[PDB]
Amino acid sequence: DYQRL
Amino acid sequence: GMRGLAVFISDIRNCKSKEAEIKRINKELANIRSKFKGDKALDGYSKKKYVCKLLFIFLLGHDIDFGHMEAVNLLSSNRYTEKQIGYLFISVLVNSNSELIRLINNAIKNDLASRNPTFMGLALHCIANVGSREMAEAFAGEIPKILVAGDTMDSVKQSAALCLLRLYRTSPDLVPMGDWTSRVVHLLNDQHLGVVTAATSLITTLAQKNPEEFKTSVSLAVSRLSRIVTSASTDLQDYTYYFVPAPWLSVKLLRLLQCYPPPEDPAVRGRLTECLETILNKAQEPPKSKKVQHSNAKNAVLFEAISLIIHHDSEPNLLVRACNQLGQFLQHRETNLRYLALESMCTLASSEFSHEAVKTHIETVINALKTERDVSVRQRAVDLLYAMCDRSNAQQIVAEMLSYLETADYSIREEIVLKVAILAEKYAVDYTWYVDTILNLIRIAGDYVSEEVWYRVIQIVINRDDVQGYAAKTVFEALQAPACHENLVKVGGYILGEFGNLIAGDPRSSPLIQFNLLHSKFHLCSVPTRALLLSTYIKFVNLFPEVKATIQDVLRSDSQLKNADVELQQRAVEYLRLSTVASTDILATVLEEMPPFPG
Amino acid sequence: MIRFILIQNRAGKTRLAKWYMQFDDDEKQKLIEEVHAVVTVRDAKHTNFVEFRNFKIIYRRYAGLYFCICVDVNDNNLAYLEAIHNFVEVLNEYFHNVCELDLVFNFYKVYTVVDEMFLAGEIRETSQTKVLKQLLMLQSL
Amino acid sequence: GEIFELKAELNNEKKEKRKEAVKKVIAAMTVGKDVSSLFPDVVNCMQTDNLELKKLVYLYLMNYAKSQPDMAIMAVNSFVKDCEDPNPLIRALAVRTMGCIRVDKITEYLCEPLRKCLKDEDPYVRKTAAVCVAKLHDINAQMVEDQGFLDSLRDLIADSNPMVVANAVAALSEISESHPNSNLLDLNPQNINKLLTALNECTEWGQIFILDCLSNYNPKDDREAQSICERVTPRLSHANSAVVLSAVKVLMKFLELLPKDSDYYNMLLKKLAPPLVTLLSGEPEVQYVALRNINLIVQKRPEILKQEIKVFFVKYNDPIYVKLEKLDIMIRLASQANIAQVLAELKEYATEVDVDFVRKAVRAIGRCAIKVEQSAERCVSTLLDLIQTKVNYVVQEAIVVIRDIFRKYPNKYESIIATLCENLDSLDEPDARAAMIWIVGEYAERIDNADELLESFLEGFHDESTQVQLTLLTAIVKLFLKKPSETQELVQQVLSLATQDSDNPDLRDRGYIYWRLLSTDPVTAKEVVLSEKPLISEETDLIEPTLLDELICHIGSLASVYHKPPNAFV
Amino acid sequence: MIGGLFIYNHKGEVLISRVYRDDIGRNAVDAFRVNVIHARQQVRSPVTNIARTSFFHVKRSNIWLAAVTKQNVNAAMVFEFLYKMCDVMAAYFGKISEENIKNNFVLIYELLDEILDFGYPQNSETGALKTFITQHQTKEEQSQITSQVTGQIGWRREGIKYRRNELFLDVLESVNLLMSPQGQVLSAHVSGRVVMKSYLSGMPECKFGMNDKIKQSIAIDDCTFHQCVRLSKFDSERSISFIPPDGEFELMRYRTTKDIILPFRVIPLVREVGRTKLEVKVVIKSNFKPSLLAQKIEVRIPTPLNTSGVQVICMKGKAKYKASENAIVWKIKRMAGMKESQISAEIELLPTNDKKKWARPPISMNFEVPFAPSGLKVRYLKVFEPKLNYSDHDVIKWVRYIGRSGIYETRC
């Protein structure tokens, strides 16, 4: 889901 | 006592969505269809439960296309509950199949042949509930044989009387006035008052086509009514409803009396008058009970008595008391009595004798029209004012109606417009008043004027030849206002097309100004209005040669000659070619002032 | 003449519909939502007597249900209102304070009661005691 | 019943039960029950300081003092005392509640608090006072003190806070409805610059209000219009959908600069389209409004969405109104290059299950036939097949469009007359009946059955639409002019029926005109009625140009959605 | 110029009633109830005219929401206000349901009194509404709250504090595709939006950047933004600068029609064997990196109306034939890129009229993918707060792309 930006 | 039925109904109700409802219905329909066709014979309880399940499914709304044969199989059953379920299924679901109709008729014939009061009641209710020509042909000869001197139970007599009522309403041709009419009339003397009520309903219906055959019913009914009303409350102990002795039977007897002319027998007419006087005098007595149902029953009997008095209109003394009682009801606290009083007072005002007595209540009628704030009661007050109107006071009635229309919603606006227009037309002592009234209707309502009203105002204006000069002037004054409805534009165009020369002398109303005023409204109007205005433009071409250039220019406009609608283009081209090509004589003779007109 | 008899809850579901005239199912529906829309808008203060179409209906609410009878224009209004009240009282006595569940679970019994009271679109039996005795005798069978 | 219990619990010392009973009373008021007799105990419960209870009691006060002034008068002292409440929130609440009371007594005592609140350091009270000035103008506002409020409100426009500026702009726009020749009261160019600057600071509703106010102003010079538009344009990006629509309205009105030699004209025409195309991707209601307005935009200025037809193709899952408007807008932009795609789309749409969509598609096929001459034969063949499908309403629409195809292309499509006249009993609509009567009358020379077809209608002449009556009268007069001897009795019959037996003043007017025209001389009547007529010239259900201009002046408003002038509906 | 605002339930009862103008009376509620809710015909428009009176209605859940005016009100403004009020009520108490309206009666009446005043929509961004609307002190906080309600920066409250400055970025897209069998894309359309969840303290000046150059860059036809972002700067210098409101909010909306990367390629194969058997095989190629896992995949294969039986053969996943939908629904829980799947189907056709040919409906497909079909990737997002001392490095940024299918059809 959440990926590092 | 049907556990399967209970669980199925709970499963139907417990569904939280229509999809689950349809799924459960389809599942149970598949189960019941499989169960009817199974090899194991179905006992009566299963047949009854499944037929009742089908009945519930059909009553929910969904269509059922099977299960009729099992239902008819229940008709020929010794148990009462199975028979009841079968008869209910037959009554609710109607199938026009010759074999099934024959089986149903055989079952009903078998039940009627028996002497069981309950089975006869079921059969009679089945005959009365479903009406068909086949059932009438089967049973119209037999049903009269049941409610005649042959000994039958009182409930059976009631059911037979109402079944014959249904068969007569459905098929009057199959119920002829035979020798049974006299002994059907003689049911008005039975001790059991339910039989008397059923007989009264049947005789009331049958008397319209055959007043002479049932002539003795008036003499039999006056005595029964007098024995009912002029008796102590102890009597009729079973049928005394909230200290009012048999209100429904009294109402039915009064209606049966109402369907006949005044009785010829002086003693009978005296009994009827005395009964009516007692009924009217019972009003002033204080109520025996404070409950509203007692007053409701008493006023039901009283209103039926008043309707009888109005229909008879043979006793001038009774009419005064009836009018006074209705006037007292006009200001009653309960709105039901106010509505009923207005409804009955309209009929009273229709009578010629009591015109002044009803006209006396004009102030309270106007007050009820203004401050009641109920749509139905205000409509009844408007109808009464319509009936109450007269040449001596038409102006006040029309003014009040216009004031109410200014504060009337949308639904009754068209009806009020029609009533005001017809009153203004009929009671126009001075014709300058009618034009102003119709202009007021066009201004206030506009959308609800309808075609007939402005048709008729043009009818009145054309024929008079004395109000035309005022009509043209007032319409010119009305058109230059910034707010003008389409009907006002139509009326103005038509009146000014023929009577524009009446006011053409005045500098303010000159042909250029009239044409400019009309062309200002030309573009913002529908197709029929534009076509009517084109006709008015050619009329102006005829009347005023000085304005011919401008009208020819506007007709020559590229927008007019290429209108999408056929009629506008047709009139534009025709009028342009008529103005251009005519030799000023044919154009003159084509356009004239026209002959005068002849729930 | 009674044209039909309806019992509706405040939601709008028809718990009884006995028709004394020939009506198509589509037209029967049209009548059902017509009656529902006309009736549920009116409150208790207004008159019980409201006209729609060629006929008119006498309605009266009992708990959540709406008991309405449709009659002709010339029929007696208060008499049919009292007929509604008599019918509701007999229902209350028979079912021991009628609710909606007694109507859904025992629809055939309620049809029997209506047939005993109103037949052929006319008032048939007005006495409560006689109707109750007849219902008891039927139940014993 | 429970009403007595509600009164009992309202008449209690405990504050919790007091406010609970107030909540149940307001609930009973909302569901429809009348609790006007329960006013005095709420009056007794007025003396408190709880903001929630105070607001609920204010709501009850407005709702019932709308019709009950006499004993609701006493709240004047409470309102006056609350006017100097240190808390601005309760100040604004009191002002907005006192202004909402429409009775005569509150009017006198509202004036001083409103004047005090108009000039305030706190801007919330200022905005509330501006809208309350509008409320006071709503009822019985002629006193010179109203003029003092109005010019104070006008001076309030030059304020640092944006929201008070927006609300004052709305108030001026509302009050400007009056027409004593003193309209709109403001908007000198310094205020134009101020408002254009304030578009940025104001909220999404403020931009709507300011753009609507600007739409009324007209530029003095040419360069002023361009300078205004260069600042209105940044609003085309989404501050709100109504913001985009209002900006489109402002730009469309201000297109009065040089059509050709000015490049900014072309730049603005290019910039207008993308927001219009984007509006269709929103919610169905906003999409419907956008399509209703795009229809008017295309009618007024066709050269905006000319090359953007692909986005208006109907989709199966679209709502019905969106589908109808998309069909209309496609037929607006149909052209020679893309006629094949739209024609295939119409062929597909003619097979849908909805009656209205199929009727509009059958209309649209004929509209394309009228618009594009090259595809006229193919569209007529498609229409003939649709007639052969034998569906009644398809036949009605095909006939009513074949009438217009005949009008646009005269004396070259006469092979269709027999197939059309075969479908005579299927016509039960006045429009198709009138169309067939016109077709029979116009081409009566080369069909022998015309007399029978025209005479068959006279049996039901009355109880028939006026359009059909007039069309029939004109058609019979035409047929008489083509063939005099064979149609002697028929014309006398129809003329007598129209003149003596009709109540319509217009119908008998036409009857007299025709009768006298035929009676005086035949050749003049033949020259008049049968004169050559100009072609309809590729009309696509066009709205009146004057009404179109008014609707363009009212793009954002609801009159554009209704496609009717504001005069029609109040 | 919203004269009145009413909310009904599915029964028809009036949940709440509020009237702002005298011209609107008790008759308007009754007219709407009898004309719109109980309408005999289903063909209508969102706005209807009833006796010189206009009614705007939207439906949320089983609840009707209506606004009635007797003036020439702005239709788009009224619809946007209705949407915004629905959003505010959802922000307070989640689902818009009947018992929620009954329980929060006073709260909805506070909202109706505040966010609208005499038909004029006031501030309704619910950032300020939280401050002075609940379910003392001195003039300082009172003037602060009043200014933040009425001032320019109304969406964000002054006193926001957090111990972990984090924000969340969500790129949501819906793709509409209709591919011709001849390899020509007849219609393409991508609708996207960036949803931002910000937990930041102070008044940060946020700069949003993306591949909108007009080595990855996409050509966006147009961008439609939020209120908080400064549109003048965007037009002048192509910069996205905004102050993020506290909580969730939709930052921007975009539309793309060029250079669309297709997530899958559909190759339909239909074989006709007389009038009894039909052979249909569908193979899909996953055109993305294997590190991305596709989820919630639905393939809808239409079947002839005269089909008597359907056989399903699948090596991966499960193939379902449902007569309720009259189509074969093929679902796969997951697979990676550069993968293939095949289905073998036997269609037995019942006897039918020879004249009636079969017009094949398009093959509709539903899917959710981690990648963005338009190709939009957030290059950077700068945050700066002059008042406080935390820098951009202290801020923690997260990004997620969820591309859901919209109208994805395949002609067969």
Side-chain angles (χ1 to χ4, degrees), chain E residues 38-135 137-162 164-214 216-251:
Chain E
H38 303 163
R40 307 290 174 87
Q41 286 94 63
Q42 307 191 278
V43 169
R44 284 85 57 84
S45 80
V47 63
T48 61
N49 192 4
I50 297 169
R52 292 181 184 270
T53 303
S54 307
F55 295 75
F56 304 79
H57 84 269
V58 304
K59 283 194 60 134
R60 292 314 204 225
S61 307
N62 296 324
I63 301 299
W64 293 67
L65 280 78
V68 56
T69 68
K70 282 165 72 33
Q71 273 104 340
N72 210 339
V73 76
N74 190 357
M77 188 255 298
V78 175
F79 280 115
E80 293 294 330
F81 174 73
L82 292 173
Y83 296 150
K84 187 62 63 67
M85 181 185 68
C86 295
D87 283 348
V88 166
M89 271 155 48
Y92 280 172
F93 40 83
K95 54 202 321 173
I96 304 167
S97 82
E98 181 256 320
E99 71 285 350
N100 292 114
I101 301 298
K102 294 312 221 323
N103 290 318
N104 293 113
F105 201 56
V106 298
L107 183 63
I108 294 91
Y109 264 106
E110 311 305 6
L111 295 179
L112 294 194
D113 189 358
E114 182 65 26
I115 73 175
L116 188 153
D117 173 329
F118 194 57
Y120 301 159
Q122 320 293 278
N123 185 12
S124 71
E125 195 63 29
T126 192
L129 301 195
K130 299 291 181 68
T131 63
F132 68 109
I133 283 174
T134 197
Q135 323 194 20
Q137 202 55 252
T138 303
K139 264 93 171 163
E140 180 66 29
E141 61 76 10
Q142 183 62 255
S143 45
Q144 193 44 290
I145 190 167
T146 300
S147 44
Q148 73 65 20
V149 175
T150 190
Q152 203 293 349
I153 306 181
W155 38 90
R156 185 171 261 280
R157 177 185 82 268
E158 301 325 324
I160 297 169
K161 284 292 211 183
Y162 270 115
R164 264 170 90 241
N165 295 338
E166 321 206 330
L167 74 164
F168 281 104
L169 276 164
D170 291 331
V171 176
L172 306 176
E173 308 198 355
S174 67
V175 290
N176 304 264
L177 179 67
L178 192 148
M179 61 79 71
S180 71
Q182 292 84 233
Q184 293 320 292
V185 172
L186 287 188
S187 188
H189 183 271
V190 179
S191 194
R193 65 182 180 179
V194 186
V195 181
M196 179 160 175
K197 274 172 310 312
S198 67
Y199 317 109
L200 295 172
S201 65
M203 301 275 138
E205 281 285 90
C206 295
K207 264 272 291 183
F208 184 95
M210 73 191 146
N211 47 4
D212 196 37
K213 299 186 159 201
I214 292 184
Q216 313 333 319
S217 66
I218 63 170
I220 296 171
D221 307 317
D222 57 17
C223 295
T224 44
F225 286 97
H226 198 259
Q227 150 78 30
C228 73
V229 62
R230 298 272 88 86
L231 269 62
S232 64
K233 292 180 183 179
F234 179 78
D235 193 46
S236 290
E237 193 255 359
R238 195 41 59 70
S239 178
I240 301 178
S241 179
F242 58 90
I243 287 176
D246 198 1
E248 202 197 8
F249 70 104
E250 184 178 1
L251 162 66

Side-chain angles (χ1 to χ4, degrees), chain C residues 25 29 33 37 46 48 54-55 69 72 74 83 94 100 104 107 111 118 125 133:
Chain C
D25 311 331
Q29 293 299 109
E33 311 68 20
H46 310 166
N48 303 307
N54 289 318
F55 312 111
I69 287 179
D72 292 276
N74 79 312
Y94 181 36
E100 189 188 283
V104 298
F107 55 96
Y111 266 86
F118 314 92
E125 191 59 54
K133 262 181 44 65

Side-chain angles (χ1 to χ4, degrees), chain D residues 176-244:
Chain D
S176 297
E177 61 76 13
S178 68
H179 206 75
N181 297 337
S182 175
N183 289 253
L184 190 141
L185 302 173
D186 67 0
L187 273 194
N188 73 307
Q190 305 70 18
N191 286 140
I192 301 299
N193 198 329
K194 209 287 192 183
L195 293 177
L196 272 181
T197 295
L199 270 74
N200 312 332
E201 300 146 40
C202 290
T203 60
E204 51 196 310
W205 319 113
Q207 284 149 91
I208 297 169
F209 296 149
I210 299 175
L211 284 160
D212 286 297
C213 166
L214 269 178
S215 296
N216 295 327
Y217 178 89
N218 60 5
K220 174 272 161 173
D221 189 358
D222 194 0
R223 294 311 71 181
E224 167 153 31
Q226 181 176 0
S227 50
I228 288 182
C229 290
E230 284 184 352
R231 283 189 280 199
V232 175
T233 289
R235 296 297 102 195
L236 287 195
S237 297
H238 177 253
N240 215 35
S241 164
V243 171
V244 178

Side-chain angles (χ1 to χ4, degrees), chain D residues 151-439:
Chain D
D151 63 358
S152 177
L153 181 83
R154 177 173 325 140
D155 296 7
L156 184 60
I157 198 154
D159 193 358
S160 65
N161 190 267
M163 185 179 288
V164 59
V165 174
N167 266 295
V169 159
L172 277 296
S173 179
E174 179 82 48
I175 297 169
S176 297
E177 61 76 13
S178 68
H179 206 75
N181 297 337
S182 175
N183 289 253
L184 190 141
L185 302 173
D186 67 0
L187 273 194
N188 73 307
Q190 305 70 18
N191 286 140
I192 301 299
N193 198 329
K194 209 287 192 183
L195 293 177
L196 272 181
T197 295
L199 270 74
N200 312 332
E201 300 146 40
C202 290
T203 60
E204 51 196 310
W205 319 113
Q207 284 149 91
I208 297 169
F209 296 149
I210 299 175
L211 284 160
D212 286 297
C213 166
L214 269 178
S215 296
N216 295 327
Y217 178 89
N218 60 5
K220 174 272 161 173
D221 189 358
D222 194 0
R223 294 311 71 181
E224 167 153 31
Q226 181 176 0
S227 50
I228 288 182
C229 290
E230 284 184 352
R231 283 189 280 199
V232 175
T233 289
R235 296 297 102 195
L236 287 195
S237 297
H238 177 253
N240 215 35
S241 164
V243 171
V244 178
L245 270 178
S246 297
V248 165
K249 169 173 69 176
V250 172
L251 298 155
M252 271 275 298
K253 161 170 166 82
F254 281 11
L255 284 176
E256 71 210 351
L257 71 173
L258 276 297
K260 179 61 69 178
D261 53 291
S262 58
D263 315 328
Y264 186 75
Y265 195 95
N266 294 356
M267 201 155 308
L268 195 39
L269 274 295
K270 293 281 297 319
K271 286 183 182 291
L272 275 183
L276 291 187
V277 176
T278 291
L279 287 153
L280 281 71
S281 296
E283 309 277 359
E285 293 84 2
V286 176
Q287 185 174 0
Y288 170 60
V289 169
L291 291 150
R292 292 297 282 186
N293 278 288
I294 282 158
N295 194 359
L296 293 181
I297 291 185
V298 171
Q299 299 203 27
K300 178 71 174 178
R301 200 90 51 180
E303 54 272 359
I304 298 181
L305 291 89
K306 204 174 61 62
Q307 310 283 140
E308 192 46 10
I309 192 66
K310 195 164 291 323
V311 298
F312 289 103
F313 281 171
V314 192
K315 291 180 181 179
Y316 184 74
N317 303 336
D318 280 3
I320 178 167
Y321 41 88
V322 178
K323 293 170 74 175
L324 294 164
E325 287 300 340
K326 269 204 213 155
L327 194 55
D328 211 359
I329 292 161
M330 293 183 286
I331 301 299
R332 294 262 153 212
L333 307 160
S335 179
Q336 203 274 300
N338 56 5
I339 193 64
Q341 306 148 47
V342 298
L343 194 63
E345 284 298 280
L346 295 169
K347 285 186 175 68
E348 211 70 15
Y349 300 152
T351 62
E352 311 266 0
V353 300
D354 203 38
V355 176
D356 291 331
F357 198 56
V358 167
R359 297 186 58 92
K360 184 172 280 292
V362 178
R363 194 71 211 290
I365 298 184
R367 299 242 300 278
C368 301
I370 299 168
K371 211 160 150 51
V372 185
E373 177 145 353
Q374 310 153 18
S375 290
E377 305 97 29
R378 294 179 66 188
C379 295
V380 167
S381 177
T382 303
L383 274 181
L384 281 193
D385 293 28
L386 293 174
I387 292 172
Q388 296 306 119
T389 56
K390 274 312 181 153
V391 193
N392 58 77
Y393 54 83
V394 171
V395 159
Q396 316 288 133
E397 213 59 32
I399 283 168
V400 72
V401 304
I402 284 279
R403 173 180 105 233
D404 284 311
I405 297 177
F406 278 149
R407 300 179 62 213
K408 177 73 173 28
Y409 294 100
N411 213 42
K412 73 186 296 294
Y413 273 12
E414 284 192 52
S415 66
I416 310 300
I417 301 299
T419 313
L420 281 194
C421 299
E422 288 179 356
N423 295 294
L424 201 43
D425 59 356
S426 280
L427 319 172
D428 63 358
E429 300 192 353
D431 291 278
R433 283 163 89 71
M436 270 293 325
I437 297 181
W438 182 91
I439 292 190

